[PDB]
Each structure stands twice: as structure tokens, then as C-alpha cells.
């Protein structure tokens, strides 16, 4: 499914993302917008034979078990199938473990290039949360 901006904003707040590891809700909504265009089914196949899965394009080489990826680590202790759901629970859970590494939200290339430094608050304006 494709989330509305305010719809994803309210779900991420419910799922406790607001200032998790010090990162405001706007940061998380921006990350999803540029990573997946708010699409929970988005995938992307990478040179190294890994795949990025779901709303936050979480990579199979470290975070989740597909069954194809070389040097594959499954740090979130889940299959990547879960990261494709319209229920964001598993993506949020996995994103909290990712961001709780010293690299923070730098784990998200699309975040670093299009979100880091900008008026991320704009991403929750009108959502009254």
C-alpha cells in the first residue's frame, strides 16, 4: 500500500518513533518519502545480490533473512517478507535496532542526501499530532 504523509506520520507516532535515538517524527516521515515514496511493497535489487524491502528500504545483507543474499546476517531476527506488510510494526521494530547503531539514521542514504539538514518538521505540518 502507499501511505499518505499524515497517515504515515500518525502511525510512526503510535509506533513510538518520535525522538527515538533523538530523531524527530519529521525525520522518519522524510526518510520513508525519499527511501520508498511511502510504498510498503517497494523493493530494490543491489549489485551485491542483496535487496532493500518496504517503507524504509531495509537491506537483506544485514537486517533480514530473504534466502538469496550473500554474507547475510539477519540482525532484526525476521524474514524480509515481514518488511513488505501494510502493517508497519516489523519495519518500525527493525528501524529502531538499525538507528540504535552508532551510525544512527545515516543507515538511510536517501535520508542523508534529501532529509539531513532540511526543515523535516514540514513533513508533519497539518497532521495535528
Amino acid at each position, epitope marked *: 500500500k502507499v501511505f499518505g504523509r499524515c497517515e504515515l506520520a500518525a502511525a510512526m507516532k503510535r509506533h*513510538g518513533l518520535d525522538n527515538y*535515538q533523538g530523531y524527530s517524527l519529521g525525520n522518519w516521515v522524510c526518510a520513508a518519502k525519499f527511501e520508498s515514496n511511502f510504498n510498503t511493497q517497494a523493493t530494490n535489487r543491489n549489485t551485491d545480490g542483496s535487496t532493500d524491502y518496504g517503507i524504509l528500504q531495509i537491506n537483506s545483507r544485514w537486517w533480514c533473512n530473504d534466502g538469496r543474499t550473500p554474507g547475510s*546476517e539477519n540482525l532484526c*531476527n525476521i524474514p524480509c517478507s515481514a518488511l513488505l506488510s501494510s502493517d508497519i510494526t516489523a519495519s518500525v*521494530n527493525c528501524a529502531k535496532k538499525i538507528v540504535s547503531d*552508532g*551510525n544512527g539514521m545515516n543507515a538511510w542514504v536517501a535520508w542523508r542526501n534529501r532529509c539531513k539538514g532540511t526543515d523535516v518538521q514540514a513533513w508533519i505540518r497539518g497532521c495535528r499530532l
Partner: antibody, heavy 113, light 108 residues
Framework: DVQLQESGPSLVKPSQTLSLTCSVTGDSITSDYWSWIRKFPGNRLEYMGYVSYSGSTYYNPSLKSRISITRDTSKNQYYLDLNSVTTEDTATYYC???????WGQGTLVTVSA | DIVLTQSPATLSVTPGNSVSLSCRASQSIGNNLHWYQQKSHESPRLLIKYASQSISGIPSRFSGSGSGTDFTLSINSVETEDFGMYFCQQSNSWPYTFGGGTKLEIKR
């Protein structure tokens, strides 16, 4: 399945280093984030620290930078070193994964001359 | 750092009856509240993650709710083996902290 077991001395002299090993069986040190938690004799729990996949560590500021958490991928172990112990460091020590599904049996450490 | 306050310090309950355990956060922790069971100094065991999400192998009679600053672990139809310490733990902010624990006695 993943099993955790703490090992090392149960007796440490004051002002010296408390060194504990967590041995992991049934998956890789590279497969998770790895924590140390301790419990003081009066049912009080303290999150000490964890080491994440990149080597970045998080140390409780209560520990006044007396703490080192390191790994050895080849032995499938991670370590706790806690420097300059006093009797206030007498506690039961647990290794656990960041998710908190996997816990060691925990080991009692007494600080005493 | 975030202070977790558990109420009450103790409960005694008869098997088959229900209890409610309270955990209040010094500041908003969103949904970042996990519930553990421990008997004395044996290894803690995770009952609930993120306020309300189920853990495979934990019975349905354990239910977590709440958000922001106010949380609740509900234990329906208590069994003899539910004795021990119940701890809440926040992961909203490092350093992660634990409440002071609720002690559960079986009535017999």
C-alpha cells in the same frame, strides 16, 4: 537455538578490573547487538552497555567511563571489563542480546579483599 | 535519564484471578516500554515488547497497554508459576532504565 553463558572470576579486589566473558552458541557474534545487565542485591536492575554491528558501544553514564565492551568474532564471544571496582559493583552480571530474547544464567561477582 | 515508577510494590492473588501492574515514565516514552518476569536472580524473561506486542511462547493471559507516560501489564487467570518480580524497561532513551519492580505472591 541461541544460548548465552557468562564465565570469569566471582571475586575481584577493590580498585581492580572485573573481567567477564559471554559465550554465544547457535549463531554468530555478527548476528546481533550484545548487552551486559547487572542486578544489585536489592532487586535493582542496571543496563550497563551494548555493542552494535559496526563496533559502536553505548555505556551507561552512571559507570563514569569505567566500562569496556569488546568482541572476538573467531571465539564467538564478547567481553565486559569494568575498571576501579568498589563494593558498590558487587552484583549479578547478565549477558543478553539487545532484543532481550536471549539471556545468560547470570554470574555473581563479589568485590572484596 | 528516564525514571520508571512501578505500583504497587506487592500483589498477592489467588490462582484463576486477575491483576493489573502499573508503570509510569518520568517523561513520554511513546510505545518504547518492555515488560520482564524474574524469579529472584534467575534470568529475566521478556513478556511484552513495545508496550503491547506479543512474544511467541508467552501466554495470551499476559496483555500490555498504554502509551506516553502511563503503562499497564494485565495478567488474567494467574497460575502458580507467575510468582516473582515484574519489571518494566524503557528503550526510548539511552541509558535504558528499569522500574523498581512489582512483587507477585500466590495466595494458597
Amino acid at each position: 537455538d541461541v544460548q548465552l553463558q557468562e564465565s570469569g572470576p566471582s571475586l575481584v579486589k577493590p580498585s581492580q578490573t572485573l573481567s567477564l566473558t559471554c559465550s554465544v552458541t547457535g549463531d554468530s557474534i555478527t548476528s546481533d547487538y550484545w548487552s551486559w545487565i547487572r542486578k544489585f542485591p536489592g532487586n535493582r536492575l542496571e543496563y550497563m552497555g551494548y555493542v552494535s554491528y559496526s563496533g559502536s558501544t553505548y555505556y551507561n553514564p552512571s559507570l563514569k567511563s569505567r566500562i569496556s565492551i569488546t568482541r572476538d568474532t573467531s571465539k564467538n564471544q564478547y567481553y565486559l571489563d569494568l575498571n576501579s571496582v568498589t563494593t558498590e559493583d558487587t552484583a549479578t552480571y547478565y549477558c543478553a542480546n539487545w532484543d532481550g530474547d536471549y539471556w545468560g544464567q547470570g554470574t555473581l561477582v563479589t568485590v572484596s579483599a | 535519564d528516564i525514571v520508571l515508577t512501578q505500583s504497587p510494590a506487592t500483589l498477592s492473588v489467588t490462582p484463576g484471578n486477575s491483576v493489573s501492574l502499573s508503570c509510569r515514565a518520568s517523561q513520554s516514552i511513546g510505545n518504547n516500554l518492555h515488560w520482564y518476569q524474574q524469579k529472584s536472580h534467575e534470568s529475566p524473561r521478556l513478556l511484552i515488547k513495545y508496550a503491547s506486542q506479543s512474544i511467541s511462547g508467552i501466554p495470551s493471559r499476559f496483555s500490555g497497554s498504554g502509551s506516553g507516560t502511563d503503562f499497564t501489564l494485565s495478567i488474567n487467570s494467574v497460575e502458580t508459576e507467575d510468582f516473582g518480580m515484574y519489571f518494566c524497561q524503557q528503550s526510548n532513551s539511552w541509558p535504558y532504565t528499569f522500574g523498581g519492580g512489582t512483587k507477585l505472591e500466590i495466595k494458597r
